[PDB]
Design a protein around this ligand. Sequence first.
Ligand SMILES: *C[C@@](*)(O)[C@H](CCCNC(N)=[NH2+])NC(=O)[C@@H]1CCCN1C(=O)[C@H](N)Cc1ccccc1
Ligand code: NA
Lengths: 258, 7, 32
Amino acid sequence: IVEGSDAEIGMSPWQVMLFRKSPQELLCGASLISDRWVLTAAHCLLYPPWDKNFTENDLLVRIGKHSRTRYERNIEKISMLEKIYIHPRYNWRENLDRDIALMKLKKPVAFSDYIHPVCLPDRETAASLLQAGYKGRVTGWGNLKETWTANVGKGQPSVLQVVNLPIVERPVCKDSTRIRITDNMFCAGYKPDEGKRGDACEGDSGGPFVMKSPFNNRWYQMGIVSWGEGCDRDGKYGFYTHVFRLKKWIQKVIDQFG
Amino acid sequence: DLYDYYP
Amino acid sequence: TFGSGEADCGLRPLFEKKSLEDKTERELLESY
Ligand SMILES: *C[C@@](*)(O)[C@H](CCCNC(N)=[NH2+])NC(=O)[C@@H]1CCCN1C(=O)[C@H](N)Cc1ccccc1
Ligand code: NA
């Protein structure tokens, strides 16, 4: 996360960390949507141009963590993966269309003050909140800068980072990049004319873009950190997988596959 | 339309 | 069925359930 701040304790209790098991390496973010289902980005698990094809046994998740500078005994939890589902039309060849995956946990987690699931948007939340200029919130332990920067560094922070960023109108998203954008994506970030800065970056993939409903005061996961070009460049915007658009897939996997 | 590949 | 998730989803024990606001959530609401 670039130009974010340290999270308050319990501020993002749906935050999930996706680690490589051998050796232990933080790969991506993720989010908790029940005691046993975690959302992430497909590319965190499967990306053939890089010979990446992680199986259930390659990975583990950590939940309820605030700081990497401590084992948070009695608070943080771990699970191995029972099953991975990648969207069957995830487009790794071209543009990461449908950059979404579900992971089912071998050890369902007990909810606590630090561990709690996020909502998925209903139609009303999507229509009302997915508007240019409306801000959502992005969280992660990924890189602090695109490139090593004096007096900041680059790579992973100790404390979970948080940044609030406005949704950007589709034509501006489209015009910002030569990569082909689709309706299963949106973009967010400040424009050069707004002065404020901030973005996701490498390592934040799979983390949630959440918005708080003014109607019922619940948090809803609208996006998944998916891709960008650099981080926090002027005239560039982070790209997010559009959770609502892909929700019927999520529901079918959870409702039907067991 | 509203949802990807649905119905 | 799953729908939008479980009955208590999206309500944080240490914030919403205690009627406490986090330090930046007002920035979101002001954008709406
Ligand atoms: C895996 C994720 O951590 C990461 C998130 C990047 C977010 N960037 C910003 N500025 N918000 N995504 C990736 O690194 C993806 C995986 C494949 C390559 N990639 C990219 O973002 C490239 N920089 C651009 C790209 C390449 C191929 C297809 C789409 C985008
Ligand atoms: Na930018």
